[PDB]
Amino acid sequence: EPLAAGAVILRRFAFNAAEQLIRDINDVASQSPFRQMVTPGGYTMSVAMTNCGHLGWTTHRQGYLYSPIDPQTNKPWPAMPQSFHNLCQRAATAAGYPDFQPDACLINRYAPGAKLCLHQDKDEPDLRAPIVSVSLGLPAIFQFGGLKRNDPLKRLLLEHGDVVVWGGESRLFYHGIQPLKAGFHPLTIDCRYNLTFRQAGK
DNA sequence: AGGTAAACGT
DNA sequence: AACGGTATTACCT
Ligand SMILES: [Fe+3]
Questions:
Q1: E strands within A29-112?
Q2: What is the SS3 assignment for A194?
Q3: Annotated binding-site residue numbers of A for Fe cation
Q4: Where would I find the Fe2OG dioxygenase domain in this sequence?
Q5: Which bases in strand C are touched by protein, i.e. have an atom under 7 Å from a CB?
Q6: What is the spatial distance, in angstroms and rounded to an integer, between the CA atom of A151 and the C1' atom of C5?
Q7: Largest CB tally within 10 Å, which of A2, A80, A83, A173?
Q8: Cα A174 to averaged position of ligand 1 atoms, centre (Å)
């Protein structure tokens, strides 16, 4: 019944911290606005994204990249809010990763219908560090697979405040998000947000 | 030699 | 609509 080797779900872990997290998402986005990024192959992603911390994930003509600069504003990504950093540290510790030091937080916003096709997180050079993923707002179905794309999927509803952590043996597992169902949430109104914490540099 | 990118039909 | 083809290649370093 645990998610996977090295992976855990902490249901409602961030529920108490959620209102402050959402205030800080709005602050981050007031500086580096949400944008829907374009893949190298030229398709616009359905998820809108921004980043905070020292490195932000971005698409480019040439591929994917972690960059210290927001290519839309040409300014550094906003500093990682202390509320984000503290929640991440607490969740990582609860999940068995007490030494995790993230330097990058990708903020995803899902409107109805928005999805993330099954992929691997592998843009980070240090594979030893876990990924911490915080869900806020509307619920979504998270796919969590194996090392091969065709490995059987677990499908888990992620609700407001749920935190998922993966690392170690499951660090490179395929995962994704199924198209978001429309709904109402009193804190986010009509969307889902996700915070994904990584150590993207040295 | 390796790593990268991937988001339509059944 | 869950599953899997496609990158079975074309480019970089
Ligand atoms: Fe991911």
A1: 48-52, 56-60, 63-67, 104-110
A2: strand
A3: 119, 121, 175
A4: 101-201
A5: 2-7
A6: 15
A7: A173
A8: 8
The domain locations on chain A are 1-202
| Residues A164 and A126: beta-carbon distance below 8 Å | no
Q: Which CATH architecture has domain A1-202?
A: Sandwich (2.60)
Structure tokens at A141: 């179905």
Q: How far is CA A32 from CA A26, A95, A176, A201, in A?
A: 10, 30, 24, 20
Q: Token pair of A49, please?
A: 């994204």
Tokens describing residue A77: 């990504």
Q: Tell me if A168 sits within 8 A of A130, measured CB to CB.
A: yes
Residue A3 CA to its chain's centroid (Å): 17
Residue linked to tokens 């903020």: A107
Resolution in A: 1.6
**Nucleotide nearest residue A149, measured CA to C1':** C4
Nearest to A50 by CA among A34, A26, A28, A70: A34
The technique is: X-ray
Å between A62 CA and B7 C1'? 15
**Angular region, A34: left φ>0, alpha ψ -120 to 50, beta rest:** beta
Return the residue matching tokens 């065709």: A150
The Cα A126–Cα A113 span in angstroms is: 33
